[PDB]
Amino acid sequence: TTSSALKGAIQLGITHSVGSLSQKPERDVLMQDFEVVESIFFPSQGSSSTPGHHHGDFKFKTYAPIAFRYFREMFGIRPDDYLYSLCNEPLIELSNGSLFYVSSDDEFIIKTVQHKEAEFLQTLLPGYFMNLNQNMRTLLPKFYGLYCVQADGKNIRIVVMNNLLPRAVPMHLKFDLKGSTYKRRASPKERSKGVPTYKDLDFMQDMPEGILLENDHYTALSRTMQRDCRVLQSFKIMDYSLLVGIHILHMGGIPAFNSKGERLLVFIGIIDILQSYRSVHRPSFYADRFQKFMCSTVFRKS
Amino acid sequence: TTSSALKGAIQLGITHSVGSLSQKPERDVLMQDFEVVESIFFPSQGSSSTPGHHHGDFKFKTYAPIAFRYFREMFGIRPDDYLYSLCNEPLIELSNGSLFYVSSDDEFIIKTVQHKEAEFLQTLLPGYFMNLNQNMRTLLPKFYGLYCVQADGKNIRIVVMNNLLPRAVPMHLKFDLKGSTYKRRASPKERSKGVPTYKDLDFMQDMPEGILLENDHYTALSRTMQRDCRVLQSFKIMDYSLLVGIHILHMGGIPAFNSKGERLLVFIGIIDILQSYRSVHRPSFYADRFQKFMCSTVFRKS
Ligand SMILES: Nc1ncnc2c1ncn2[C@@H]1O[C@H](COP(=O)(O)OP(=O)(O)NP(=O)(O)O)[C@@H](O)[C@H]1O
Ligand SMILES: Nc1ncnc2c1ncn2[C@@H]1O[C@H](COP(=O)(O)OP(=O)(O)NP(=O)(O)O)[C@@H](O)[C@H]1O
Ligand SMILES: [Mn+2]
Ligand SMILES: [Mn+2]
Ligand SMILES: [Mn+2]
Ligand SMILES: [Mn+2]
């Protein structure tokens, strides 16, 4: 596998990409900043600029840098913290089209992306920025960066973002949910796992009484969802899932009560947000369903 | 004059336009919201919808409504306060291409606009929004609304915004400044006025020692300028002026000390921001000059 071959390009690349930035001084982000893409050549020899290596000659494309500085900033991600947990610490792979890696400290996920998807996102940024500065408590992904790598002719685009479910809290039940049902059962292979990543039906069978929620916690979530859904819909986006991580216990997550009655810290966040039909009311449709489901069935009041 | 003929269309129009909105419920603003433009027919009879009148049949175009709701909101402009001081209180005209009106309470200015200009601005919005949510203390105009009126075939576009120099503080000296000089003297006609609106040279002759500024006040202004200039520049914008209103005294404005030495509350804000070359470095040029001027010559430290 060209796996650890790539794992390198990333860590060498970012590190240079970000150290690069911390020279250039702070300045508000501008509509222009979004469309930019800065590339950097990595000779296996190494220039007096691009040095080190023994890995596999590649270019390292960095995307909309000033924006992702801004976003990190706004998501409170100190760069050395970023650079560190991300570049000086082996990226551990992951089974789940779409290859996921993880920070050695379970902080950060990396996805790859269909070039269609990167390009979409490039466009999304402004829309993101807006939401971000308005629903401070939105559920959408926290995109810390977008970058691409060149394996000879082959091109790999990737996005770095918040692992929603850090090891730090041991999650008991884990559902990926959609408000849909066809194939929405966790395949056999998946269920042979510790805490496995279930799905709509699994949740419907295994939990039909609900996730109970102290009135005012339900509310926030609900509106906050309905806001995200209104955004997402606006970009003709589909296939998004609410990833939920329930934790029975006997400080980052949401409080809840059980079918039985244990106190619960629950963790959630919408994902898989880059496939957009960029029919006319279809995305509108998939948003209301997601809503009515999560807000009526998955979570419920008192 | 079709003046008071127009003064009506505005006050009848907005009022309907805004009352209209306060039905539709709150929701975050979205990239789409900017491009929208809602029109409303005003028969001199009046529908059961558009009623009243005896003034002159017209349509009332409203621009990017949800954004200007959002902006007002963010500039802290309660609508009834808006609607009131603006619609239920005679708009007083003003001598100064470009017709200015004023709120009966000196809160709000109205300009007209070259359709080129409206169209530019329509595009600017996103860029505005960004700046706005980052330089909270920016100097750019506070655009409370954009609207247009139809006089038969004739079309009038207008923008409502913050009077920078309310009667509430009596301004002694008043300069419109640019960091340029050709014709930058206040014409004779102008000087025959109470406090008149001077200009670069007038300021250079009448005040050459400066406007003195307690270190940390100078700083903010300076960066805040340099931010605005970096925005403005990005939109290939030109002819903008820093409007200054100095007030000798013996709570909204800036503190300062004199050539002599009186305490001073100074009021400022960049204007005339809609003419953009939308040469290649020219706007960049006009920004640095504006900067170096206001920051070296017009204001200076200690
Ligand atoms: N931010 C995240 N935090 C934790 N786990 C994640 C995150 N993103 C993805 N995953 C895991 O990977 C699964 C989702 O992959 P997904 O993001 O839906 O990409 P995909 O490959 O397009 N799958 P599909 O829904 O068929 O399109 C989830 O069920 C999670 O368990
Ligand atoms: N927000 C404001 N507050 C107070 N006065 C204003 C404001 N905007 C404009 N004015 C007054 O009107 C003058 C500027 O008109 P301006 O906005 O420059 O439009 P213009 O008609 O394009 N003039 P020009 O600079 O030749 O293009 C200023 O010197 C002010 O005295
Ligand atoms: Mn998915
Ligand atoms: Mn997907
Ligand atoms: Mn001007
Ligand atoms: Mn002008």
Side-chain angles (χ1 to χ4, degrees), chain A residues 2-6 8-11 13-23 25-39 41-48 51-53 55-58 60 62-92 94 97 100-113 115 117-136 138-151 153 155-168 170-172 175-181 184 186-188 190-191 194 196-204 206-208 210-211 213 215-235 237-245 247 249 252-256 258-259 261 264 266-274 279-291 293-300, chain B residues 2-6 8-11 13-23 25-39 41-48 51-53 55-58 60 62-92 94 97 100-113 115 117-136 138-151 153 155-168 170-172 175-181 184 186-188 190-191 194 196-204 206-208 210-211 213 215-235 237-245 247 249 252-256 258-259 261 264 266-274 279-291 293-300:
Chain A
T2 56
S3 166
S4 77
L6 142 151
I10 289 170
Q11 296 160 309
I14 285 181
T15 289
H16 175 274
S17 153
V18 176
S20 158
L21 195 46
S22 293
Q23 263 78 311
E26 267 52 33
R27 49 151 287 244
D28 290 329
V29 57
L30 286 180
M31 202 67 75
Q32 291 68 232
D33 293 318
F34 289 140
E35 289 138 56
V36 336
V37 204
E38 313 192 309
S39 175
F41 196 114
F42 273 58
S44 209
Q45 279 190 81
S47 79
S48 30
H53 215 331
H55 230 142
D57 267 56
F58 69 86
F60 188 75
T62 310
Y63 282 81
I66 269 63
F68 291 99
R69 174 174 66 188
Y70 168 90
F71 295 123
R72 271 184 253 108
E73 192 166 305
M74 293 266 288
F75 294 130
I77 282 149
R78 310 195 152 284
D80 321 79
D81 286 304
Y82 184 61
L83 280 171
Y84 189 78
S85 39
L86 213 68
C87 311
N88 316 292
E89 245 196 359
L91 295 165
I92 91 190
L94 239 193
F100 297 84
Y101 291 75
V102 171
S103 65
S104 281
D105 60 334
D106 230 38
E107 267 275 308
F108 294 144
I109 327 200
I110 317 207
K111 242 244 272 261
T112 48
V113 287
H115 144 84
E117 287 180 330
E119 277 208 353
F120 168 83
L121 170 76
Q122 280 218 279
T123 87
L124 186 60
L125 262 37
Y128 194 65
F129 186 98
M130 287 213 235
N131 170 61
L132 211 207
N133 289 95
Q134 289 193 84
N135 192 184
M136 334 62 177
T138 192
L139 298 159
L140 313 188
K142 303 203 191 308
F143 296 123
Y144 305 138
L146 178 69
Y147 322 81
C148 150
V149 213
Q150 212 148 37
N155 249 4
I156 305 90
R157 324 263 184 165
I158 51 118
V159 23
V160 179
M161 52 196 274
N162 44 323
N163 170 229
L164 230 64
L165 296 176
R167 90 173 93 270
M171 230 62 63
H172 310 336
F175 308 96
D176 167 326
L177 304 178
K178 281 193 186 188
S180 75
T181 54
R184 225 90 236 305
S187 70
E190 181 65 19
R191 335 229 329 165
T197 308
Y198 292 141
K199 254 140 146 143
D200 280 64
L201 293 159
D202 309 61
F203 178 106
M204 291 265 47
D206 299 352
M207 197 142 184
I211 303 190
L213 220 45
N215 167 224
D216 284 342
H217 274 92
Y218 174 90
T219 303
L221 162 137
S222 160
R223 87 188 292 240
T224 288
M225 197 124 77
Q226 143 199 49
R227 286 162 81 189
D228 300 357
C229 290
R230 201 185 270 86
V231 165
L232 281 177
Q233 170 168 10
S234 102
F235 293 89
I237 308 183
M238 312 261 299
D239 126 83
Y240 42 88
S241 331
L242 183 50
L243 181 51
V244 174
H247 168 92
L249 41 59
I254 317 163
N258 209 343
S259 271
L264 292 157
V266 201
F267 300 84
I268 82 181
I270 298 193
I271 45 160
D272 219 5
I273 248 174
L274 265 23
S279 170
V280 299
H281 296 284
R282 193 94 148 99
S284 167
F285 182 65
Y286 181 24
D288 291 21
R289 195 176 66 203
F290 196 100
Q291 261 294 144
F293 189 62
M294 272 76 187
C295 275
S296 299
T297 298
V298 177
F299 306 84
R300 16 194 167 189
Chain B
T2 56
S3 166
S4 77
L6 142 151
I10 289 170
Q11 296 160 309
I14 285 181
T15 289
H16 175 274
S17 153
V18 176
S20 158
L21 195 46
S22 293
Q23 263 78 311
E26 267 52 33
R27 49 151 287 244
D28 290 329
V29 57
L30 286 180
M31 202 67 75
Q32 291 68 232
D33 293 318
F34 289 140
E35 289 138 56
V36 336
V37 204
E38 313 192 309
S39 175
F41 196 114
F42 273 58
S44 209
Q45 279 190 81
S47 79
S48 30
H53 215 331
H55 230 142
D57 267 56
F58 69 86
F60 188 75
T62 310
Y63 282 81
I66 269 63
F68 291 99
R69 174 174 66 188
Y70 168 90
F71 295 123
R72 271 184 253 108
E73 192 166 305
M74 293 266 288
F75 294 130
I77 282 149
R78 310 195 152 284
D80 321 79
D81 286 304
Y82 184 61
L83 280 171
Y84 189 78
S85 39
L86 213 68
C87 311
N88 316 292
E89 245 196 359
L91 295 165
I92 91 190
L94 239 193
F100 297 84
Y101 291 75
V102 171
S103 65
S104 281
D105 60 334
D106 230 38
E107 267 275 308
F108 294 144
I109 327 200
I110 317 207
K111 242 244 272 261
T112 48
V113 287
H115 144 84
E117 287 180 330
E119 277 208 353
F120 168 83
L121 170 76
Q122 280 218 279
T123 87
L124 186 60
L125 262 37
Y128 194 65
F129 186 98
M130 287 213 235
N131 170 61
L132 211 207
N133 289 95
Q134 289 193 84
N135 192 184
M136 334 62 177
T138 192
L139 298 159
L140 313 188
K142 303 203 191 308
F143 296 123
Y144 305 138
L146 178 69
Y147 322 81
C148 150
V149 213
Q150 212 148 37
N155 249 4
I156 305 90
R157 324 263 184 165
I158 51 118
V159 23
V160 179
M161 52 196 274
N162 44 323
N163 170 229
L164 230 64
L165 296 176
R167 90 173 93 270
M171 230 62 63
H172 310 336
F175 308 96
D176 167 326
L177 304 178
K178 281 193 186 188
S180 75
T181 54
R184 225 90 236 305
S187 70
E190 181 65 19
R191 335 229 329 165
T197 308
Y198 292 141
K199 254 140 146 143
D200 280 64
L201 293 159
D202 309 61
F203 178 106
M204 291 265 47
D206 299 352
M207 197 142 184
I211 303 190
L213 220 45
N215 167 224
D216 284 342
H217 274 92
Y218 174 90
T219 303
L221 162 137
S222 160
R223 87 188 292 240
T224 288
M225 197 124 77
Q226 143 199 49
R227 286 162 81 189
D228 300 357
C229 290
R230 201 185 270 86
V231 165
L232 281 177
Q233 170 168 10
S234 102
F235 293 89
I237 308 183
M238 312 261 299
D239 126 83
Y240 42 88
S241 331
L242 183 50
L243 181 51
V244 174
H247 168 92
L249 41 59
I254 317 163
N258 209 343
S259 271
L264 292 157
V266 201
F267 300 84
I268 82 181
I270 298 193
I271 45 160
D272 219 5
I273 248 174
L274 265 23
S279 170
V280 299
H281 296 284
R282 193 94 148 99
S284 167
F285 182 65
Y286 181 24
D288 291 21
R289 195 176 66 203
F290 196 100
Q291 261 294 144
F293 189 62
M294 272 76 187
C295 275
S296 299
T297 298
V298 177
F299 306 84
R300 16 194 167 189

